[PDB]
Write a protein that binds this ligand. Structure first.
Ligand SMILES: NC(=O)c1ccc[n+]([C@@H]2O[C@H](COP(=O)([O-])OP(=O)(O)OC[C@H]3O[C@@H](n4cnc5c(N)ncnc54)[C@H](O)[C@@H]3O)[C@@H](O)[C@H]2O)c1
Ligand SMILES: NC(=O)c1ccc[n+]([C@@H]2O[C@H](COP(=O)([O-])OP(=O)(O)OC[C@H]3O[C@@H](n4cnc5c(N)ncnc54)[C@H](O)[C@@H]3O)[C@@H](O)[C@H]2O)c1
Lengths: 427, 427
């Protein structure tokens, strides 16, 4: 068995939910219809490290339908949906992922995607968070020469690529999929606007209405989280280090505050910073009894979980834990500080993951075909492809585009078929 | 009298409202405090073409306090606040602006800023919409050699600059002030979110709640307009030519439709496209009795007002008119299709105009000092100045910034004092 999953017999349940998700993912299904005959990824050998969800299974099978061979692992120890991994494993696709991995099992799973039977080695990386990129660069540099490039899913992974490039550590071309508009401004924002609530509500019977909720970070994710909780009747506080993002939050009616000031006043804390130890031991000590603490940023290091090692952890149910302080006060921590929407729920819904993953497929096609035209730097896909991604998703939600006349295209200086905005337009 | 205004005796009223606006405009007052002693604009001779409002008077006096000599005109025939122009005129600053100019008077006013007593000629342009830039390039090309550059306020003006550059018509450096983040994402969005309602409510006793309102265009302005009307209980429809902006509107719960389809179904139509003849005669013929039609984009050419020339126009009150169709049906048109928030009300509130105009002052300083380092192209101010603008406005609305620790700055790859985002971050 060239796979490792929890229970293979969950495959039929996974297939059923995959069939449903396909009908919510028109971008991926359109790429199959456009490309599955020509097979533009025949000869592609993709090592993938990205949350093994039902939506990711549709990504995997789209890559396969386009001719790729892949080997897959998840980029988080709690984010796998076992029945999704099983459905993929049942198709014969090598996948190494289950919900609740140890850290040792996590890195073993990543390692399994770098080599397969018969001397299989990847010529492409598909990464979400930079761990697979890290492993190849730091531990298998012999693989780097045959890797055409990496396409990277998330903000934290791109930050790691930027730092590698700055220091001359990046040795392959990189496509920043996060900063496709149809990713960052949809997945990160609208996806989290729904899936933060999913994780919070599955984990606890805590009411949102009337609570004081603090969001750390007001980037694309924090913007969605703030919208989510405000709609449900919470008083929403925001912390920011960036004065432009702080001003945006203030102009939406949020008080912009520091956790140092407000730790005693909050019922719910959501870290969305992409940063390190924004919630410290003293904050958690100061938090009220039964306060809820979770992280929706990529790595659990947003919270200094290590400071809680000596307290009793009393498990409530899977991925919901009480940490009991010596004075008897308790806090509720979700998923041990790992990504809450994927640890305590099922991640983003299918429709918005389709926009992200259509971008992923196009990046893989571009790297596989034209990696020779790229240097060892970070790039984004051109705006014409970004607009194509949006176009492919309009029909599902019944949106009808107006067509420019010739004089209207000339008036604003665009082609009738786009692209419709200057390169640095921010939407 | 080196000025032309409506009634100079309104100056004391203008001074009173200017004093109030100063307390809402901390960015401009901070630049006075930082720079009024060193006078970085001593020797600057600015021709300005920008809505002569109370907020613009604070801009003008900030430039003057920094050492500039200016001559001012408005960029719209209805947008001047007569008492603001009078307060400026009373200070001895040459200004040529009144509410309700004819088109001949409008262009005469622009012409007055290009020459003053004693052979005064500008060495800097400050433009909002591109009309002043057009006049200098097309009718006074002798002035171009001594003009250090132009800073441009709005989306439509930047579009005109881009087209000039593409064809080799741009003969001075240009600073795109619109695409400072602290302008486009604040002024265009939050400003219009308030000032569309201002104009609509001052013009008519029309209730928003229960109405079907159509916004043409879902860029920064249309986004604010949609938010405004939705908060007040209207069913909000959106039209778009750009599939990314259409998808954004759909993901906020707006039906994305064409005016060709829905003309008979709408109570209110707001053009926010920056484009040409998006509302045609047939649309207006099809609109219901007492339907309200207005434009919040820069030029009245969004609506083919010319098609209504032969119908009776029955004035309701200043800038509110009935157009009576031969079948007896009437539509209400605001400000003859000119900018509704400035024609039927007073434009954006002071706080957000401060962020825009602080950017304007910094662009003028940069052009005056360093125009030699620029070619005849369009540029934006660097992100460090954009962040400074936001920083200067945080105190007024009580927002408290978190400070990065050293390890946190290193973790995300930024300096503790910024800039905090990559150059192409979209906020
Ligand atoms: N859970 C999900 O489904 C999901 C989806 C996309 C991204 N992410 C992850 O979420 C994180 C945020 O993503 P994003 O796209 O919003 O990034 P972003 O850079 O757009 O937003 C992060 C924000 O955090 C702020 N910040 C940084 N340090 C801070 C501190 N100490 N205190 C307060 N604010 C601070 C920054 O100023 C910035 O505005 C990343 O780790 C990203 O990989 C998660
Ligand atoms: N009233 C104000 O206070 C104010 C403030 C800022 C800008 N403006 C003006 O408003 C206009 C829009 O500014 P913006 O910053 O939102 O620009 P933008 O480019 O961000 O938004 C314009 C949008 O209109 C869409 N569009 C173009 N042609 C269309 C058509 N035929 N049908 C439907 N949609 C169409 C474009 O796709 C785009 O998304 C410009 O003229 C700008 O100068 C007015």
């Amino acid at each position: 068995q060239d796979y490792k999953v929890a229970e293979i017999s969950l495959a039929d349940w996974g297939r059923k939910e995959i069939a449903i998700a396909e009908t919510e993912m028109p971008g991926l299904m359109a790429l199959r219809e456009e490309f599955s005959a020509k097979k533009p990824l025949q000869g592609a050998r993709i090592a993938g490290c990205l949350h093994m969800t039902i939506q990711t299974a549709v990504l995997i099978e789209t890559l396969v339908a386009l001719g790729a061979e892949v080997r897959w692992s998840s980029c988080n120890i709690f984010s796998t949906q076992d029945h999704a991994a099983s459905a993929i494993a049942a198709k014969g696709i090598p996948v190494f992922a289950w919900k609740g991995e140890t850290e040792e099992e996590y890195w073993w799973c990543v390692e399994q995607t770098l080599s397969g039977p018969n001397g299989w080695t990847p010529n492409l990386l598909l990464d979400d968070g930079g761990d697979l990129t890290q492993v190849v660069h730091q531990k298998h540099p012999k693989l780097l020469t045959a890797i055409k490039g990496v396409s990277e899913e998330t903000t934290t992974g791109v930050a790691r690529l930027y730092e590698m490039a700055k220091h001359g550590q990046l040795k392959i071309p990189a496509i920043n999929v996060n900063n496709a508009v149809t990713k960052s401004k949809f997945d990160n924002l609208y996806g989290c606007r729904e899936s933060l609530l999913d994780g919070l509500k599955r984990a606890t019977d805590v009411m949102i209405a009337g609570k004081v909720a603090l969001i750390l970070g007001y980037g694309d994710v924090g913007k969605g989280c703030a919208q989510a909780l405000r709609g449900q009747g919470a008083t929403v506080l925001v912390a920011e280090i960036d004065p432009i993002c702080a001003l945006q939050a203030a102009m939406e009616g949020y008080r912009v505050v520091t956790l140092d000031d407000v730790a005693e006043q909050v019922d719910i804390v959501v870290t969305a910073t992409g940063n390190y130890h924004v919630v410290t031991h003293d904050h958690m000590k100061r938090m009220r009894n039964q306060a809820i603490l979770c992280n929706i940023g990529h790595f659990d290091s947003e919270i200094d979980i290590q400071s809680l090692k000596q307290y009793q952890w009393e498990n409530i149910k899977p991925q919901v834990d009480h940490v009991i302080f010596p004075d008897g006060k308790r806090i509720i921590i979700l998923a041990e500080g790992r990504l809450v929407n994927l640890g305590c729920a099922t991640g983003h819904p299918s429709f918005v993951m389709s926009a992200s993953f259509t971008n992923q497929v196009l990046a893989q096609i571009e790297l596989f075909q034209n990696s020779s035209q790229y240097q060892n730097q970070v790039y984004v896909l051109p705006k014409v492809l970004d607009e194509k991604v949006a176009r492919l998703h309009l029909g599902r939600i019944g949106a009808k585009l107006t067509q420019l006349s010739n004089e209207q295209a000339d008036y604003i200086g665009v082609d009738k078929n786009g692209p419709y905005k200057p390169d640095h337009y921010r939407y």
